[model samples]
Target: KAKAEKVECALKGGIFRGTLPIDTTVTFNADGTAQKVELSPLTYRGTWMVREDGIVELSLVEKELYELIDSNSVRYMGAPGAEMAPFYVLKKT
Candidate 1:
């Protein structure tokens, strides 16, 4: 949830929004900002703003992303434990 460079945007609910691409590769600076070398050439560079809902929404330009990228994909040697943590939260938000 820190400041980052590469942001991936998704289109859902008639709105375009996304989280910072903070995987295991990116590292954070001591001042709390994060850095990434590889970025989308079409990506936008901007500061993140926190919302009143306590959610930080980073707005990046729209890109073609697949919703079913991980659909029916198996992980962790197809172990049941690997799928246990995979769940979605349903909310009115």
Candidate 2:
């Protein structure tokens, strides 16, 4: 029931990203806000929130979702993997 809280607190203050090749980063703020960035290619920012099921909704030019895969890893719902599946998982470094 409180998975949202867990996810909410979990994401506060950190930078997350896909594989090195993607060169994209999603940063979480303590204020319940976030942004998606691509320093190489350039991108937009987003607002974020956690759903009860532990899915994070990141709102940019479009809405994107990230799923919690433990504490240090999150799965991009759009990609959801590390390869053809690899870059789908955004890890906390």
Candidate 3:
């Protein structure tokens, strides 16, 4: 199979309460860069790296780490083993 080049991350919902519907797009680039574009007229740029444990870490903002759930999904690993972290779906586009 071909390797994934880029993936788009979109907030699905909150862990407990439903978050406001956000029209945001976070893209993970193959060059180890990340960008976030929000409909609220905001843009953010940062760096991202994959740790040896297979966790995706965003070097900016909250410095959150995401776990790869499958080929098309990633779940936020919050609070060290907290099973209720938010998840975002990743789509190759």
Candidate 4:
């Protein structure tokens, strides 16, 4: 088994309400370090990680049901996606 190194990153952007366009950019930075990333804004609230195999992936931790979903019965952020992007490893400082 491959031991995964955990790195923390912050989402740098404001959460916009009402018809927030998709493909807007958000950002992530190395926790307690000096690395930053610009990601397209998909929704509000989430974190990402990098793996050892040099793959960068995004994990959408929360989803705005009002923004992404159109069901009256369902509300709030729920359920993780079946597929997601892979993360890449970053240089340890």
> Order of all candidates by TM-score, from best down to worst?
2, 3, 4, 1
- Cα error, residue 1 of model 1, in Å, equals 18
Model 3 alpha-carbon drift over 4 Å, by segment: 1-21, 78-92
- Using TM-score as the yardstick, the better of models 2 and 3 is 2
lDDT against the true structure, each candidate? 0.23, 0.77, 0.50, 0.27
Per-prediction TM-score: 0.23, 0.81, 0.57, 0.28
Candidate 1, residues 7-61, lDDT tens digits: the string is 2221122122222222111222233333222233232333333333323333233
Tens digits of per-residue lDDT, candidate 4, 1-93, equal 132232222121222122111223333444411122234533433554444542234455432111112111111222234221112112122
Q: Listing every candidate in turn, what is its Cα RMSD in Å to the true structure after a full C-alpha superposition?
A: 15.2, 3.4, 7.4, 13.6
Off by over 4 Å in 1: 1-44, 61-93
Candidate 2 lDDT by residue in tens digits, 1-93: 589888887789977887644667888888877877776467776688787888888887557788888888787776323135456778887
Lowest lDDT sum, 10 consecutive residues, model 3, at 11-20
Off by over 4 Å in 2: 39-41, 79-84
Ranking by lDDT: 2, 3, 4, 1
Cα distance off (Å), candidate 1, residue 60: 3.2
Candidate 2 colliding pairs: 81-85, 81-86, 81-88, 82-85, 82-86, 82-87, 83-86
